[PDB]
Amino acid sequence: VINDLTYHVRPPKRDLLSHENAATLNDVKTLVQQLYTTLCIEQHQLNKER
Amino acid sequence: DVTVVYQNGLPVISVRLPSRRERCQFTLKPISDSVGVFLRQLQEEDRGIDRVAIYSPDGVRVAASTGIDLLLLDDFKLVINDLTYHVRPPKRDLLSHENAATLNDVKTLVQQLYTTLCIEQHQLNKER
Amino acid sequence: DVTVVYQNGLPVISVRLPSRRERCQFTLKPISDSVGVFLRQLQEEDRGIDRVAIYSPDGVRVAASTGIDLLLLDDFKLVINDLTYHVRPPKRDLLSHENAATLNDVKTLVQQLYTTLCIEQHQLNKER
Amino acid sequence: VINDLTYHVRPPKNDVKTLVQQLYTTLCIEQHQLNKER
Amino acid sequence: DVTVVYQNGLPVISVRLPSRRERCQFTL
Amino acid sequence: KPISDSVGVFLRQLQEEDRGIDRVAIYSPDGVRVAASTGIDLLLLDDFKL
């Protein structure tokens, strides 16, 4: 969107990833993030440096 | 009407804005961001917000020092200038109270993804 | 009226703050956080706080760059402009004797998973 | 671009798989090291 | 819904504002 | 001073007199907002929701 001109723009789409594998990999990412938040890794991490 | 969905590992929160009354979305890193950065991002994207603040649902205000993902374990009340929004889709999933079973889930997904890509052939192709 | 709560092994200090008379809670760190920036963010959350100070009740000022874990054992006296608050830290239980190796194995393994995930966009960042 | 003339200046001079392979070996370092120690 | 009325010699225009959706007035 | 000051000058003085204030306004006896450049004497004709 520019001044009153809705240029609808698309990229030349390259997927290079299946949908089910994307869902599994997203689950892996979010699950590691939730566990990092859950058991408070960075506290233990700075505790080793201390 | 505030939602949040995990697209590709990042939480994508989507929110209604006062000026121009368009819903806007915000993709934010759970680790490199505090809520103060998020409120800067709200008042930076659209300057029609006089006051914004995040309320934990006990009425207590979540100040601008906490982590995003620390706040994403709970649902919470978002206050734009007058409209409040108790936002509760953050998809609280860690009800197991067992960390080892979640790591079993981790290696289950990893072995599944290892198998479905036939990646050992790619590794031998790299060495070849 | 100010309480200190352990959430996820982290101290949460909820404060009855000035003019917008609310509870504002602070998610802190024992080690990386210190008094000199805790008071900075407390001054950040309400600009109208003129004089803020903190000390163990026999002391007159606990020092700047005091470790918060040193303060998480003693009854500090929190000082705001009109208000004083001497309050206590809660008790921190531990199972670091027989679940120690198991939980630290889990901590090490999930940190290795996290540095597997996050390192790719950090290599390029450090290269830039 | 100058007002008239044109310099063709000549100066002299997958990604998911690597991540999931590092992730796969991250699950199976410790038992492999404990076996290789013996 | 914009109006303007002459209060004491000055035009007092009153207008709706997007943020907070309160009508505001302007004496000019 | 009603002969020299506008609403915005009074509100910036009320703003700087504290620091813990962020939102200030002067409303009508009705719900509408008196602007910044309005003269004080026009505001002191009647009451107002501060």
Tab-separated table of C-alpha atoms in Angstrom:
chain	number	residue	atom	x	y	z
A	1	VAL	CA	0.000	0.000	0.000
A	2	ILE	CA	1.287	3.400	-1.128
A	3	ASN	CA	-0.933	6.539	-1.371
A	4	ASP	CA	-4.366	5.199	-2.474
A	5	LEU	CA	-2.772	2.575	-4.731
A	6	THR	CA	-3.039	-1.042	-3.612
A	7	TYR	CA	-0.272	-2.692	-5.586
A	8	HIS	CA	-0.944	-6.368	-4.962
A	9	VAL	CA	2.523	-7.902	-5.153
A	10	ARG	CA	3.593	-11.537	-5.140
A	11	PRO	CA	7.006	-13.189	-4.896
A	12	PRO	CA	8.125	-15.994	-7.195
A	13	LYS	CA	7.275	-18.696	-4.703
A	14	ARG	CA	9.871	-21.278	-3.699
A	15	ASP	CA	8.552	-23.650	-1.044
A	16	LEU	CA	11.442	-26.135	-0.567
A	17	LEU	CA	9.687	-27.657	2.468
A	18	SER	CA	6.749	-30.001	2.894
A	19	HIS	CA	3.811	-28.940	5.028
A	20	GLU	CA	3.853	-31.858	7.474
A	21	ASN	CA	7.592	-31.458	8.011
A	22	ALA	CA	7.073	-27.723	8.548
A	23	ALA	CA	4.463	-28.512	11.200
A	24	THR	CA	6.751	-31.020	12.926
A	25	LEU	CA	9.696	-28.606	12.837
A	26	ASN	CA	7.516	-25.788	14.183
A	27	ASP	CA	6.429	-28.096	17.003
A	28	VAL	CA	10.087	-28.847	17.760
A	29	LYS	CA	10.979	-25.131	17.826
A	30	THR	CA	8.073	-24.140	20.061
A	31	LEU	CA	8.543	-27.119	22.358
A	32	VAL	CA	12.230	-26.370	22.937
A	33	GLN	CA	11.321	-22.710	23.529
A	34	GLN	CA	8.614	-23.649	26.029
A	35	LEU	CA	10.999	-25.948	27.882
A	36	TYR	CA	13.731	-23.288	27.888
A	37	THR	CA	11.190	-20.974	29.489
A	38	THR	CA	9.807	-23.695	31.757
A	39	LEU	CA	12.937	-24.950	33.479
A	40	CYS	CA	14.736	-21.551	33.321
A	41	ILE	CA	17.920	-22.539	31.522
A	42	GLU	CA	19.612	-19.118	31.431
A	43	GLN	CA	19.622	-18.997	35.232
A	44	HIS	CA	21.585	-22.265	35.415
A	45	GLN	CA	23.692	-21.067	32.494
A	46	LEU	CA	24.808	-17.926	34.288
A	47	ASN	CA	25.153	-20.031	37.437
A	48	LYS	CA	27.906	-22.068	35.775
A	49	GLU	CA	29.772	-18.858	34.926
A	50	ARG	CA	29.381	-17.584	38.497
B	1	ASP	CA	-10.529	-10.107	19.717
B	2	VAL	CA	-6.790	-10.726	20.130
B	3	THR	CA	-5.268	-13.986	18.922
B	4	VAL	CA	-1.787	-15.497	18.942
B	5	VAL	CA	-0.519	-18.386	16.820
B	6	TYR	CA	2.904	-19.991	16.520
B	7	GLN	CA	4.078	-19.545	12.935
B	8	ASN	CA	7.458	-21.227	12.379
B	9	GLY	CA	8.514	-21.046	16.014
B	10	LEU	CA	7.598	-17.491	16.589
B	11	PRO	CA	4.423	-16.354	18.330
B	12	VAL	CA	2.432	-14.221	15.916
B	13	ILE	CA	0.094	-12.101	17.996
B	14	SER	CA	-2.612	-10.224	16.113
B	15	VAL	CA	-4.328	-7.213	17.620
B	16	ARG	CA	-6.824	-4.464	16.798
B	17	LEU	CA	-5.492	-0.927	16.549
B	18	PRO	CA	-7.475	2.245	17.338
B	19	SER	CA	-6.237	4.515	14.564
B	20	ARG	CA	-7.726	3.518	11.169
B	21	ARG	CA	-9.336	0.508	12.982
B	22	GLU	CA	-7.237	-2.115	11.211
B	23	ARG	CA	-6.175	-5.320	12.866
B	24	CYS	CA	-2.385	-5.595	12.939
B	25	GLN	CA	-0.108	-8.506	13.691
B	26	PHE	CA	3.204	-8.650	15.527
B	27	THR	CA	5.824	-11.382	15.156
B	28	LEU	CA	8.184	-11.307	18.114
B	29	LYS	CA	11.109	-13.389	19.325
B	30	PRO	CA	10.393	-15.087	22.672
B	31	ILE	CA	13.983	-14.693	23.875
B	32	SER	CA	15.457	-11.425	22.558
B	33	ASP	CA	12.376	-9.394	23.501
B	34	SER	CA	10.956	-7.975	26.691
B	35	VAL	CA	7.428	-6.666	26.978
B	36	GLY	CA	8.869	-3.154	27.055
B	37	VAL	CA	10.183	-3.710	23.534
B	38	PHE	CA	6.727	-4.952	22.570
B	39	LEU	CA	5.019	-1.859	23.949
B	40	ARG	CA	7.573	0.313	22.166
B	41	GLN	CA	6.623	-1.638	19.056
B	42	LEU	CA	2.930	-0.938	19.652
B	43	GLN	CA	3.396	2.793	20.216
B	44	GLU	CA	5.899	2.862	17.346
B	45	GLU	CA	3.780	1.097	14.733
B	46	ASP	CA	0.721	3.254	15.369
B	47	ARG	CA	1.041	6.471	17.370
B	48	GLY	CA	-2.640	6.652	18.231
B	49	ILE	CA	-2.075	4.900	21.520
B	50	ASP	CA	-1.715	7.221	24.482
B	51	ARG	CA	-1.344	4.546	27.153
B	52	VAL	CA	-0.749	0.810	26.838
B	53	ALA	CA	-0.053	-1.635	29.679
B	54	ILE	CA	-0.183	-5.383	30.250
B	55	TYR	CA	-2.225	-6.735	33.140
B	56	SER	CA	-1.783	-10.137	34.640
B	57	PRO	CA	-5.358	-11.383	35.246
B	58	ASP	CA	-5.111	-10.802	39.017
B	59	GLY	CA	-5.203	-7.066	38.266
B	60	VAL	CA	-1.469	-6.804	38.876
B	61	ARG	CA	0.376	-4.962	36.132
B	62	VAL	CA	3.194	-6.791	34.381
B	63	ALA	CA	6.014	-4.263	34.215
B	64	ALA	CA	8.426	-3.782	31.317
B	65	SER	CA	11.256	-6.021	32.529
B	66	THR	CA	9.893	-9.524	32.065
B	67	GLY	CA	10.497	-11.913	29.233
B	68	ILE	CA	7.922	-12.487	26.536
B	69	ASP	CA	7.788	-16.260	26.939
B	70	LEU	CA	7.623	-15.865	30.720
B	71	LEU	CA	4.477	-13.867	30.075
B	72	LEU	CA	3.315	-16.394	27.464
B	73	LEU	CA	2.995	-19.203	30.006
B	74	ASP	CA	-0.060	-17.362	31.313
B	75	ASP	CA	-2.926	-15.613	29.685
B	76	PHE	CA	-3.118	-11.930	30.403
B	77	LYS	CA	-5.055	-8.722	29.929
B	78	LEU	CA	-3.901	-6.188	27.364
B	79	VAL	CA	-5.058	-2.608	27.825
B	80	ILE	CA	-5.057	-0.281	24.849
B	81	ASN	CA	-6.184	3.290	25.724
B	82	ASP	CA	-9.672	2.289	26.850
B	83	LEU	CA	-10.416	-1.155	25.414
B	84	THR	CA	-9.204	-4.093	27.444
B	85	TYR	CA	-8.468	-7.489	25.964
B	86	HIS	CA	-8.061	-10.625	28.012
B	87	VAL	CA	-6.021	-12.567	25.475
B	88	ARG	CA	-6.120	-16.312	26.090
B	89	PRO	CA	-5.006	-18.355	23.035
B	90	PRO	CA	-1.242	-18.686	24.028
B	91	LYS	CA	-1.740	-22.501	23.880
B	92	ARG	CA	-0.491	-23.614	27.287
B	93	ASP	CA	0.559	-27.182	26.555
B	94	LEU	CA	2.983	-28.142	29.354
B	95	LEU	CA	0.485	-29.794	31.670
B	96	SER	CA	2.478	-33.036	31.862
B	97	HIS	CA	4.649	-32.105	34.906
B	98	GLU	CA	7.208	-34.563	33.481
B	99	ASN	CA	10.205	-33.206	31.624
B	100	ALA	CA	11.549	-36.592	30.524
B	101	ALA	CA	8.358	-37.465	28.625
B	102	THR	CA	8.626	-34.136	26.821
B	103	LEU	CA	12.172	-35.054	25.840
B	104	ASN	CA	10.801	-38.380	24.618
B	105	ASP	CA	8.404	-36.298	22.509
B	106	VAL	CA	11.390	-34.236	21.312
B	107	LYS	CA	13.401	-37.222	20.157
B	108	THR	CA	10.234	-38.795	18.729
B	109	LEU	CA	9.684	-35.761	16.508
B	110	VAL	CA	13.390	-35.555	15.683
B	111	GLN	CA	13.579	-39.209	14.654
B	112	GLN	CA	10.401	-38.808	12.601
B	113	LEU	CA	11.862	-35.784	10.848
B	114	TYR	CA	15.188	-37.593	10.415
B	115	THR	CA	13.433	-40.468	8.695
B	116	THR	CA	11.004	-38.505	6.514
B	117	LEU	CA	13.726	-36.427	4.860
B	118	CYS	CA	16.017	-39.404	4.040
B	119	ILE	CA	18.791	-37.141	5.216
B	120	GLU	CA	21.462	-39.803	5.771
B	121	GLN	CA	21.642	-40.041	1.991
B	122	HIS	CA	22.176	-36.271	1.910
B	123	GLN	CA	25.014	-36.580	4.416
B	124	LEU	CA	26.672	-39.322	2.386
B	125	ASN	CA	26.135	-37.128	-0.671
B	126	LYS	CA	27.965	-34.311	1.116
B	127	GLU	CA	30.885	-36.598	1.964
B	128	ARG	CA	30.834	-37.934	-1.605
C	1	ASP	CA	2.092	-4.953	51.289
C	2	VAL	CA	4.904	-5.859	48.892
C	3	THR	CA	5.357	-9.608	48.410
C	4	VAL	CA	8.163	-11.672	46.888
C	5	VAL	CA	7.057	-14.815	45.044
C	6	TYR	CA	9.169	-17.501	43.364
C	7	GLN	CA	7.781	-18.076	39.879
C	8	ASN	CA	9.757	-20.652	37.850
C	9	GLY	CA	12.659	-20.237	40.244
C	10	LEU	CA	12.623	-16.472	39.749
C	11	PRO	CA	11.676	-13.817	42.316
C	12	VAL	CA	8.552	-11.807	41.537
C	13	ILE	CA	8.308	-8.568	43.513
C	14	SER	CA	4.818	-7.075	43.313
C	15	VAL	CA	4.811	-3.460	44.505
C	16	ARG	CA	1.981	-1.113	45.374
C	17	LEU	CA	3.353	1.789	43.361
C	18	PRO	CA	2.460	5.525	43.349
C	19	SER	CA	-0.139	7.594	41.681
C	20	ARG	CA	-1.691	5.007	39.405
C	21	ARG	CA	-2.352	2.946	42.507
C	22	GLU	CA	-1.732	-0.539	41.169
C	23	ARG	CA	0.238	-3.664	41.843
C	24	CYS	CA	3.221	-3.855	39.517
C	25	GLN	CA	5.238	-7.063	39.570
C	26	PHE	CA	8.877	-7.396	38.548
C	27	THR	CA	10.454	-10.544	37.138
C	28	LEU	CA	14.057	-10.492	38.284
C	29	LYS	CA	17.319	-12.415	38.258
C	30	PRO	CA	19.549	-13.281	41.192
C	31	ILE	CA	22.866	-13.026	39.337
C	32	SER	CA	22.640	-10.962	36.131
C	33	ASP	CA	20.313	-8.425	37.718
C	34	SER	CA	21.609	-6.018	40.348
C	35	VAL	CA	20.304	-3.241	42.568
C	36	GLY	CA	21.686	-0.453	40.367
C	37	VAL	CA	19.461	-1.442	37.448
C	38	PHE	CA	16.570	-2.758	39.562
C	39	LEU	CA	16.155	0.733	40.982
C	40	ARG	CA	16.603	2.051	37.442
C	41	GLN	CA	13.661	0.035	36.145
C	42	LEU	CA	11.647	0.861	39.270
C	43	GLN	CA	12.232	4.522	38.478
C	44	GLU	CA	11.316	3.673	34.883
C	45	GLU	CA	7.920	2.232	35.792
C	46	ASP	CA	6.846	5.408	37.579
C	47	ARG	CA	8.630	8.594	36.576
C	48	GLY	CA	7.212	10.521	39.526
C	49	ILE	CA	9.155	8.569	42.151
C	50	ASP	CA	11.501	11.209	43.547
C	51	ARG	CA	13.747	9.365	46.005
C	52	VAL	CA	14.009	5.585	45.993
C	53	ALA	CA	16.383	3.609	48.190
C	54	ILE	CA	16.893	0.197	49.733
C	55	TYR	CA	18.858	-1.115	52.718
C	56	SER	CA	19.013	-3.869	55.255
C	57	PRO	CA	17.464	-2.294	58.377
C	58	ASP	CA	20.738	-1.933	60.277
C	59	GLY	CA	22.362	-0.440	57.189
C	60	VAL	CA	21.582	2.955	55.734
C	61	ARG	CA	22.046	2.038	52.036
C	62	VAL	CA	22.687	-1.378	50.626
C	63	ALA	CA	25.358	-0.827	48.006
C	64	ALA	CA	24.885	-0.353	44.309
C	65	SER	CA	25.834	-3.456	42.304
C	66	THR	CA	24.707	-5.659	45.165
C	67	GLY	CA	23.817	-9.158	44.046
C	68	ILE	CA	20.092	-9.787	44.286
C	69	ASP	CA	20.737	-13.292	45.606
C	70	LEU	CA	22.601	-11.643	48.482
C	71	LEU	CA	19.396	-9.682	49.043
C	72	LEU	CA	17.163	-12.757	48.621
C	73	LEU	CA	18.020	-13.920	52.165
C	74	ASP	CA	17.664	-10.750	54.264
C	75	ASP	CA	14.773	-8.444	55.087
C	76	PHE	CA	15.584	-5.408	52.978
C	77	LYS	CA	13.827	-2.149	53.776
C	78	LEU	CA	12.440	-0.777	50.515
C	79	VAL	CA	12.126	3.010	50.491
C	80	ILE	CA	9.824	5.043	48.242
C	81	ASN	CA	9.073	8.778	48.655
C	82	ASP	CA	6.313	8.635	51.274
C	83	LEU	CA	6.545	4.908	51.844
C	84	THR	CA	8.843	2.406	53.503
C	85	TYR	CA	8.614	-1.365	53.255
C	86	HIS	CA	10.750	-3.838	55.154
C	87	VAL	CA	9.822	-7.231	53.702
C	88	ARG	CA	11.173	-10.750	53.595
C	89	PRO	CA	12.187	-13.215	50.904
C	90	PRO	CA	10.439	-16.595	50.721
C	91	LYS	CA	12.108	-19.946	51.195
C	92	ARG	CA	13.842	-21.674	48.282
C	93	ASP	CA	13.549	-25.447	48.407
C	94	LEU	CA	15.868	-27.739	46.473
C	95	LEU	CA	16.225	-31.312	45.253
C	96	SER	CA	19.871	-30.975	44.206
C	97	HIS	CA	21.071	-34.248	45.743
C	98	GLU	CA	19.563	-37.204	43.875
C	99	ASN	CA	17.542	-35.457	41.178
C	100	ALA	CA	20.564	-33.178	40.687
C	101	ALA	CA	22.331	-35.182	37.978
C	102	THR	CA	19.067	-35.998	36.179
C	103	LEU	CA	17.758	-32.432	36.145
C	104	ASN	CA	21.153	-30.984	35.252
C	105	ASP	CA	21.389	-33.533	32.443
C	106	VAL	CA	18.024	-32.257	31.227
C	107	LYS	CA	19.185	-28.642	31.600
C	108	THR	CA	22.384	-29.336	29.674
C	109	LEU	CA	20.578	-31.284	26.963
C	110	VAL	CA	17.850	-28.710	26.373
C	111	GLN	CA	20.473	-25.957	26.364
C	112	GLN	CA	22.348	-27.905	23.708
C	113	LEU	CA	19.095	-28.144	21.757
C	114	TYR	CA	18.600	-24.414	22.149
C	115	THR	CA	22.104	-23.637	20.968
C	116	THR	CA	21.441	-26.001	18.101
C	117	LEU	CA	18.401	-23.955	17.100
C	118	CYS	CA	19.553	-20.410	17.806
C	119	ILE	CA	23.162	-20.536	16.595
C	120	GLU	CA	22.424	-20.144	12.869
C	121	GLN	CA	21.009	-16.626	13.066
C	122	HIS	CA	23.759	-15.747	15.529
C	123	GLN	CA	26.667	-16.787	13.301
C	124	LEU	CA	25.454	-14.446	10.565
C	125	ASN	CA	24.733	-11.699	13.102
C	126	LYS	CA	28.259	-11.951	14.492
C	127	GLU	CA	29.614	-12.008	10.938
C	128	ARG	CA	27.726	-8.800	10.069
D	1	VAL	CA	24.681	7.824	-14.823
D	2	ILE	CA	26.209	11.113	-15.909
D	3	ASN	CA	24.275	13.485	-18.213
D	4	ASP	CA	25.374	11.769	-21.399
D	5	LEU	CA	27.600	8.701	-21.053
D	6	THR	CA	27.328	5.275	-19.492
D	7	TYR	CA	30.104	3.562	-17.540
D	8	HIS	CA	29.760	-0.218	-17.620
D	9	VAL	CA	32.080	-0.379	-14.617
D	10	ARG	CA	33.552	-3.848	-14.176
D	11	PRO	CA	35.054	-4.538	-10.751
D	12	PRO	CA	37.081	-7.682	-10.087
D	13	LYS	CA	35.880	-10.260	-7.597
D	14	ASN	CA	19.260	-27.931	2.442
D	15	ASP	CA	19.444	-25.321	5.166
D	16	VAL	CA	16.673	-27.169	6.998
D	17	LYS	CA	18.602	-30.413	6.610
D	18	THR	CA	21.807	-29.145	8.220
D	19	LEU	CA	19.851	-27.806	11.197
D	20	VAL	CA	17.901	-31.002	11.718
D	21	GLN	CA	21.077	-33.066	11.365
D	22	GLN	CA	22.709	-31.004	14.096
D	23	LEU	CA	19.509	-31.475	16.079
D	24	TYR	CA	19.593	-35.230	15.496
D	25	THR	CA	23.175	-35.568	16.595
D	26	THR	CA	22.470	-33.346	19.604
D	27	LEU	CA	20.086	-36.012	20.902
D	28	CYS	CA	22.700	-38.725	20.338
D	29	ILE	CA	26.032	-37.334	21.435
D	30	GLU	CA	26.058	-38.444	25.046
D	31	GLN	CA	25.238	-42.137	24.658
D	32	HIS	CA	27.630	-42.310	21.705
D	33	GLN	CA	30.411	-40.753	23.797
D	34	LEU	CA	29.625	-43.040	26.726
D	35	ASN	CA	29.867	-46.053	24.416
D	36	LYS	CA	33.022	-44.783	22.721
D	37	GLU	CA	34.659	-44.254	26.127
D	38	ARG	CA	34.357	-47.945	26.972
E	1	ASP	CA	-20.981	14.281	12.271
E	2	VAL	CA	-19.005	17.540	12.254
E	3	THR	CA	-20.601	20.825	13.281
E	4	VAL	CA	-19.434	24.386	13.866
E	5	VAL	CA	-21.147	27.042	15.983
E	6	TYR	CA	-20.153	30.651	16.607
E	7	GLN	CA	-19.525	31.004	20.337
E	8	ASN	CA	-18.667	34.614	21.229
E	9	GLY	CA	-17.374	35.518	17.784
E	10	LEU	CA	-15.243	32.515	17.284
E	11	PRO	CA	-16.186	29.478	15.215
E	12	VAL	CA	-16.183	26.457	17.496
E	13	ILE	CA	-15.843	23.444	15.238
E	14	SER	CA	-16.465	20.057	16.829
E	15	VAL	CA	-15.101	16.873	15.312
E	16	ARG	CA	-14.773	13.140	15.958
E	17	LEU	CA	-11.290	11.802	16.600
E	18	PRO	CA	-10.100	8.273	15.736
E	19	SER	CA	-7.956	7.544	18.778
E	20	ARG	CA	-10.123	6.852	21.872
E	21	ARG	CA	-13.183	7.754	19.690
E	22	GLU	CA	-14.009	10.943	21.583
E	23	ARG	CA	-15.509	13.952	19.893
E	24	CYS	CA	-13.252	16.981	20.300
E	25	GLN	CA	-13.846	20.650	19.672
E	26	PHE	CA	-11.593	23.371	18.306
E	27	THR	CA	-11.967	27.115	18.834
E	28	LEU	CA	-10.002	28.969	16.182
F	1	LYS	CA	-3.501	34.300	33.035
F	2	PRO	CA	-6.686	34.178	30.938
F	3	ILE	CA	-5.498	36.919	28.599
F	4	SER	CA	-2.256	35.192	27.600
F	5	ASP	CA	-2.422	31.454	28.244
F	6	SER	CA	-4.030	28.659	26.283
F	7	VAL	CA	-5.037	25.233	27.564
F	8	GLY	CA	-1.882	23.569	26.234
F	9	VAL	CA	0.447	25.796	28.250
F	10	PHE	CA	-1.460	25.035	31.454
F	11	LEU	CA	-1.408	21.339	30.646
F	12	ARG	CA	2.329	21.303	29.976
F	13	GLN	CA	2.843	23.117	33.274
F	14	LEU	CA	0.699	20.485	34.996
F	15	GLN	CA	2.702	17.894	33.076
F	16	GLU	CA	6.095	19.146	34.245
F	17	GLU	CA	4.944	19.787	37.818
F	18	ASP	CA	4.971	16.012	38.272
F	19	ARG	CA	6.575	13.204	36.327
F	20	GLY	CA	4.302	10.220	37.087
F	21	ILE	CA	1.500	11.610	34.968
F	22	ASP	CA	1.090	10.598	31.329
F	23	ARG	CA	-2.541	11.248	30.362
F	24	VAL	CA	-4.182	14.618	30.974
F	25	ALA	CA	-7.265	16.186	29.422
F	26	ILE	CA	-9.943	18.772	30.065
F	27	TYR	CA	-13.411	17.659	29.120
F	28	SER	CA	-16.610	19.614	28.705
F	29	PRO	CA	-19.563	19.411	31.024
F	30	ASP	CA	-20.488	17.092	28.161
F	31	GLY	CA	-18.152	14.305	27.135
F	32	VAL	CA	-16.269	16.247	24.475
F	33	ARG	CA	-12.652	17.353	24.728
F	34	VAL	CA	-11.519	20.953	24.911
F	35	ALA	CA	-8.476	21.324	22.676
F	36	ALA	CA	-4.979	22.569	23.484
F	37	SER	CA	-5.159	25.996	21.834
F	38	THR	CA	-8.422	27.028	23.492
F	39	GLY	CA	-8.188	30.125	25.656
F	40	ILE	CA	-8.518	29.786	29.409
F	41	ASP	CA	-11.194	32.478	29.723
F	42	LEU	CA	-13.386	30.558	27.283
F	43	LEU	CA	-12.830	27.524	29.488
F	44	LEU	CA	-13.643	29.479	32.656
F	45	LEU	CA	-17.069	30.407	31.314
F	46	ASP	CA	-18.486	27.187	32.800
F	47	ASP	CA	-17.400	24.084	34.691
F	48	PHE	CA	-15.375	21.240	33.196
F	49	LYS	CA	-14.447	17.614	33.804
F	50	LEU	CA	-10.742	17.680	34.556
